[PDB]
């Protein structure tokens, strides 16, 4: 079965350029059709261009004309993409597609790369600030109350969160991140427990931000 | 350029049922199209090409149809692996576009939310910005509305909404409303309230507190 | 039971030349004409999973899908492969009985295939048949009033049958009848020419 | 015939495909007068007789060519496309069909699914597919499977854009073949039929049984496989 | 009285060019006819 794999995550800055690339593994290369497409988060997919993995042909888009380029290396059987004059919009996930096989060209994407994450930011790496989310006895709902562990103003989206290092699994909730005006991300994670065990148990969220290597724990005081 | 818009938008279903999707085109298409399945956080998988053909390795349930402009996908029985969006691709002309997204769900009796608020932490009060969290858990309808009422006034622009994705086991939805502001606004105000309007709820429900 | 599950025909019973294949699982008949790769001992099992018959089905030029005594006559003339058949019920299990029963045409296949060999297919054990050949003969068939063949005479068996054929009847009355001619045949071809003398110089 | 003429995706010239089509009932009426085929022509067999001349075996091929180049699909001429991709033996006994089609094939801005050879060492023996693209070798520095000076890629491309002129539109072409052989044929023309009148001297014809006389209804009972009866002296005296 | 698909003109033409081969050269052909009746015999020819 043909498969496509490619590079990991990237982070860049405005005005720069980035080079993503995907390696092919196909039973024959009968004028193969590596063929790029991108997706801004929560948006319509957008199509980049197609390289003629047979020889050299380079039909490109039109919204992206004059600033993106694509090449490939025959011996390594990989496909090379290049974009310049980046800006905050092109924050997206980038995809390799193609691989007809029977006939030589199509225009439908039947073999998809597992995805490449590109973030266009102006900030830099920063640790996450942490605050507890204490409930009150006012809202004792069925003898159960909610509780959480906020994270604010943090840089890359690598913000694993857990409670007492896997000790708790029930009712856990971890919301997706949100961009702010300041250009920093923020997350809120929450969980509810029977209020009966409020004053007699110990809950501490567990956060790991690898791009800054920080590990923070905070006991929640009701 | 060719425009592609799907009138279906979001849809609803339950296991073991049939669904239909419409993909309309601004111009005439000579049955050039394909249908992609995309689970959350994964890569797209192709289902149908040339608007009719069934590509190998897929369940036999899927089936295309249609020609000209109005195009249709349809599945007989609704298996679990069908729970994701679906896109339509035109390839009649140049720059090839895509649809909007048509996402399925798991219907159940509507679930009433449970509302919660958190006052800002005093450690956050040391920093210099104020954060307020209004929470909604386990409400089956994804669509809802939350508004903030501070000192008996509505508040706009400074609020952000983040909504979870529906859980397989839970099959419900959960929401957080965050209100952020600078300290100078904080003590200037005495009473804080977030209000939520929900289909399952009989009446709009207000939850609130004041400082201390 | 059904141990006889069709035949396989052809010249080489493999690839590099075309052949016919006539099969019957517990479902129904499957005629087929491809180039195959046939097991040298091909059969089908009886779970009830089976068909170790071939291992190749290339270039198919014709398809089709859908105790007891079961006779069949197979012949192959001018690119047509004709099949006659009849199903009579015996009151034995597995011995060849005696009697008369004419076989009615079943199929006609405009293949073009060459044939020189054939086989049989059997359902194994996991949980009797005959083969005649046909020659150019002359027969006298008796037709019923509904149009069925009820009796026949082979006109080359014995002198009585040759007389019945000469008279075109099934009862000959006493007499003497001229039935044929007889002639002794010559052996060899001895030739004679003049001596190879006066040889060219 | 209906689906090949209406298949949605035709192959390019170099990868033309066949169909070992046989044991069926052709009907060339509509195919002849569909009033849409810009180029119907053939050889060996007249365009009208072909309604009935039963054929041994028939082969159908199809591809897509440049517009003006259509003439080169015929015996006894040259042209870059008929030179390296497809040529017809001079004893050809089939028919050639071509009709304009960009409304289906010319994706606007340019189609690139259609490729054809340009350089090959040898002229192409009739009726062979040569799929494997080979880099052309010219004079010094012969090149195989590499791109550079003295090395030429063989598969060019059609830029089928609707803005092109008639001379460069794309054409879907399909070509047939017929031949006369030993074994009895298997694809005959459609057979004209009519009602049956009784109690009058007529000229009848049942399947090939030809005679004249008056037909009445009978009290015989054939056997399901029996198709006609005859009496002593072997004259036909009944029919089904 | 129209030209189009299925509309041909019956009179083709010979392109009698000397560069052609023997198989396509032009040939002037003349053909005669004779018969017998009860009287005419008007054309006999020499025999004195
Ligand atoms: C019986 O054998 C034929 C041989 O190809 C096969 O097509 C058919 O599916 C078989 N029957 C069943 C029930 O599979
Ligand atoms: C028969 O099969 C062989 C191998 O699959 C192939 O080479 C050959 O072309 C086939 N015959 C025809 C007439 O295509
Ligand atoms: C069958 O085999 C013979 C071998 O003598 C061959 O001459 C003949 O052509 C074959 N049949 C056909 C239809 O080709
Ligand atoms: C068949 O033949 C039998 C005996 O010869 C006769 O009695 C019968 O009427 C015929 N027709 C039938 C059985 O339909």
E-state strands within chain D: 20-21, 24-25, 39-42, 58-66, 95-100, 136-137, 151-152, 170-177, 187-188, 201-206, 209-214
A19 Cβ contact list (under 8 Å, min separation 6): A80, A81, A82
Give, using CA atoms, the residue closest to atom 6 of ligand 2.
Answer: C59
Q: How many CB pairs under 8 A join D and E?
A: 4
Residue of C nearest to D22 (CA): C61
Number of other CB atoms surrounding residue D160 within 10 Å: 23
Distance CA B68, CA B70 (A): 6
Nearest to D120, CA basis, from D158, D83, D65: D83
Minimal C-alpha gap between B50 and chain D (Å): 8
Note whether C touches B: 3 CB pairs or more under 8 A.
no
Q: Spell out which residues of chain E touch residue D40, defining contact as CB-CB under 8 Å.
A: 5
Rounded to the nearest angstrom, the minimum Cα separation between C182 and chain D is 30
**Which CATH architecture best describes the domain C1-183?**
Sandwich (2.60)
How many CB atoms sit inside 10 A of residue D128's CB?
Answer: 8
* Complete DSSP assignment for B100-144: ---------S----EEEEEPPPHHHHHHTEEEEEEEEE--S-S--
Mutate to test the interface with A, among B115, B176, B209 (most CBs of A within 10 A): B176
Q: CA-CA distance, C86 to D202, in Å (whole number)?
A: 39
Cβ of C103 below 6 Å from ligand 1: no
Q: What is the resolution in angstroms? A: 3.7
Nearest-angstrom CA–CA distance, C45 and E4: 66
Rounded to whole angstroms, how far apart are CA atoms A159 and A179? 14
> Residue B52 Cα, ligand 1 centroid: separation in angstroms?
27
**D31 DSSP assignment:** H
Rounded to an integer, what is the distance from CA B14 to the centroid of its chain? 17
CB-CB under 8 Å, A109 with B36: yes
Which residue, among E1, B173, C185, C180, has the nearest Cα to A173 in the 3D structure? B173
Contacting residues of D for C147, CB less than 8 Å apart: 221-223, 226, 229
- Check CB contact under 8 Å for E6 and D37: no
* CA proximity to D167, closest of D69, D38, D80, D71: D69
Q: Do D9 and B50 touch (CB under 8 A)?
A: yes
For the CA of C113, the nearest atom of ligand 3 = 13
- Pairing relationship of beta strands D151-152 and D136-137 according to DSSP bridges: antiparallel
* C-alpha of residue D22 to centroid of ligand 1, in Å: 24
Rounding to the nearest 10 degrees, give the CA dihedral for residues D144, D150, D154, D157: 140
The CA distance from B45 to D87, in Å, is: 41
Cα C27 to ligand 1 centre (Å): 7
Residues of D with CB below 8 A from A104's CB?
Answer: 12, 113, 115, 155
Give the start-end residues of each E strand in A168-211: 173-174, 178-179, 185-194, 204-209
Per-residue DSSP letters for A68-100?
Answer: EEEEEETTTTEEEEEEES--GGG-EEEEEEE--
Chain B contact for D46 (CB, 8 A cutoff): no
D8: nearest CB among B50, B91, B92: B50
**CB C135 near ligand 4, within 6 Å:** no
Tell me which residue has tokens 């010559």: C186
Q: Distance between CA atoms of B27 and B3, rounded to whole angstroms?
A: 8
* Token reading at C194: 């003049």
List, in sequence order, every beta strand (DSSP E) within chain B.
Answer: 4-5, 19-25, 33-38, 45-49, 53-54, 63-66, 71-75, 85-90, 114-118, 129-137, 145-150, 154-155, 159-163, 175-182, 191-197, 205-210
Sequence-separated contacts (24+) of D4-7 with Cβ below 8 Å? D4/D60, D4/D62, D4/D174, D5/D31, D5/D174, D7/D62
CA distance D106 to D167: 14
Helices (H), D42-184: 80-84
Residue nearest to atom 9 of ligand 3 (CA): C114
In terms of phi and psi (left: phi > 0; alpha: psi -120 to 50; beta: otherwise), the region of A115 is left
| d(CA B158, nearest CA chain A) in Å | 10
Task: Tell me which chain E residues have a C-beta less than 8 angstroms from the C-beta of D33.
Answer: 6
Interface of D with A in 112-131 (CB under 8 A): 112-113, 115
Contact (CB<8Å) D222/C78: no
Task: Considering every ligand atom shown, identify the ligand nearest to the alpha carbon of residue D219 and give its number.
Answer: 4
User: Minimal Cα distance from E6: which residue of D?
Assistant: D33
D contacts of E5 (beta carbons < 8 Å): 35, 37, 40
With an 8 Å Cβ cutoff, is D8 touching chain B?
A: yes
Consecutive H or E run containing C163: helix C159-167
Q: How far is CA C62 from CA B195, C7, C22, C30, in A?
A: 74, 16, 12, 11
Q: Is D104 on the interface with B (CB under 8 A)?
A: yes
């Amino acid at each position: 079965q043909v498969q496509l794999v490619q590079s990991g995550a990237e982070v860049k800055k405005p005005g720069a350029s980035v080079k993503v690339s995907c390696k092919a593994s196909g039973y024959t290369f009968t004028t193969y059709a590596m063929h790029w497409v991108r997706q801004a988060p929560g948006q319509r997919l957008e199509w980049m261009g197609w390289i003629n993995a047979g020889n050299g042909n380079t039909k490109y888009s039109q919204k992206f004309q004059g600033r993106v380029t694509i090449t490939r290396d025959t011996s390594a059987s990989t496909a090379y993409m290049e974009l310049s004059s980046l800006r905050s919009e092109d924050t997206a996930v980038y995809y390799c597609a193609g691989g007809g096989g029977r006939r030589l060209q199509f225009d439908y994407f039947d073999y998809w790369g597992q995805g490449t994450l590109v973030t266009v930011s102006s900030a830099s790496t920063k640790g996450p600030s942490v605050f507890p989310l204490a409930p009150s006895s006012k809202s004792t709902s069925g003898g159960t109350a909610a509780l959480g562990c906020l994270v604010k103003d943090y840089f890359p989206e690598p913000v694993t969160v857990s409670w007492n290092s896997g000790a708790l699994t029930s009712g856990v909730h971890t919301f997706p991140a949100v961009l702010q005006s300041s250009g920093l991300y923020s997350l809120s994670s929450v969980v509810t427990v029977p209020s009966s065990s409020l004053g007699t148990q110990t809950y501490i969220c567990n956060v790991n931000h690898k791009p800054s290597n920080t590990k923070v724990d905070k006991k929640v005081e009701p | 350029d060719i425009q592609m818009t799907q009138s279906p938008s979001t849809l609803s279903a339950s296991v073991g049922d049939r669904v239909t999707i419409t993909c309309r085109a601004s111009q005439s298409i000579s049955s050039w199209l394909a249908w992609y399945q995309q689970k959350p956080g994964k890569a797209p998988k192709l289902l149908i090409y040339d608007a009719s053909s069934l590509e190998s390795g897929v369940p036999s349930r899927f089936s295309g149809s249609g020609s000209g402009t109005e195009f249709t996908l349809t599945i007989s029985s609704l298996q679990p692996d069908d729970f994701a969006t679906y896109y339509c691709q035109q390839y009649n002309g140049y720059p090839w576009t895509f649809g909007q997204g048509t996402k399925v769900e798991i219907k159940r009796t509507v679930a009433a939310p449970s509302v919660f608020i958190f006052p800002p932490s005093d450690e956050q009060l040391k920093s210099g910005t104020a954060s307020v969290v209004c929470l909604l858990n386990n409400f089956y309808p994804r669509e809802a509305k939350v508004q903030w009422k501070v000192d008996n006034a509505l508040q706009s622009g400074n609020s952000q909404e983040s909504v979870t994705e529906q859980d397989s086991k839970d099959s419900t939805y959960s929401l957080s409303s965050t209100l952020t502001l600078s300290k100078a606004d904080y003590e200037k105000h005495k009473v804080y309230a977030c209000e939520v309007t929900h289909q399952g709820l009989s009446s709009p429900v207000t939850k609130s507190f004041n400082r201390g | 039971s059904n141990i006889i599950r069709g035949w396989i025909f052809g010249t080489t019973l493999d690839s590099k030349t075309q052949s016919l294949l006539i099969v019957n699982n517990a479902t129904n008949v499957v005629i087929k004409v491809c180039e195959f790769q046939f097991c040298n001992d091909p059969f089908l099992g009886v779970m009830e999973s089976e068909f170790r018959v071939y291992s190749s089905a290339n270039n198919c030029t014709f398809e089709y899908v859908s105790k007891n005594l079961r006779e069949f006559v197979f012949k192959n003339i001018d690119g047509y492969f004709k099949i006659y058949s009849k199903h009579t019920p015996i009151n034995l299990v597995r011995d060849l009985p005696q009697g008369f029963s004419a076989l009615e045409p079943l199929v006609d296949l405009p293949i073009g295939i060459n044939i020189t060999r054939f086989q049989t297919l059997l359902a194994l054990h996991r949980s009797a048949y005959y083969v005649g050949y046909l020659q150019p003969r002359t027969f006298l068939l008796k037709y019923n009033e509904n149009g069925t063949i009820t009796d026949a005479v082979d006109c080359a068996l014995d002198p009585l049958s040759e007389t019945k054929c000469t008279l075109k009847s099934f009862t000959v009355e006493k007499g003497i009848y001229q039935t044929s001619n007889f002639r002794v045949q010559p052996t060899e071809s001895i030739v004679r020419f003049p001596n190879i003398t006066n040889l060219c110089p | 015939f209906g689906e090949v003429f209406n298949a949605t995706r035709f192959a390019s010239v170099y990868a033309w495909n066949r169909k070992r089509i046989s044991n069926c009932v052709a009907d060339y009426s509509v195919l002849y007068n569909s009033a849409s085929f810009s180029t119907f022509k053939c050889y060996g067999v007249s365009p009208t007789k072909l309604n009935d001349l039963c054929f041994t075996n028939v082969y159908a091929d199809s591809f897509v060519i440049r517009g003006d180049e259509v003439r080169q699909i015929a015996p006894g001429q040259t042209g870059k496309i008929a030179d390296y991709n497809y040529k017809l033996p001079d004893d050809f006994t089939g028919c050639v069909i071509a009709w304009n089609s960009n409304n289906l094939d010319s994706k606007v801005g340019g189609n690139y699914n259609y490729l054809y050879r340009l350089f090959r060492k040898s002229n192409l023996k009739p009726f062979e597919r040569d799929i494997s693209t080979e880099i052309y070798q010219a004079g010094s520095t012969p090149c195989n499977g590499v791109e550079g000076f003295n090395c030429y890629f063989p598969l060019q491309s059609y830029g089928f854009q609707p803005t092109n002129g008639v001379g460069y539109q794309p054409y879907r072409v399909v070509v047939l073949s017929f031949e006369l052989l030993h074994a009895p044929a298997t694809v005959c023309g459609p057979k004209k039929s009519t009602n049956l009148v009784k109690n009058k001297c007529v000229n009848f014809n049942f399947n090939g049984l030809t005679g004249t006389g008056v037909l009445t209804e009978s009290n015989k009972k054939f056997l399901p496989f029996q198709q006609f009866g005859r009496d002593i002296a072997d004259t036909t005296d009944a029919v089904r």
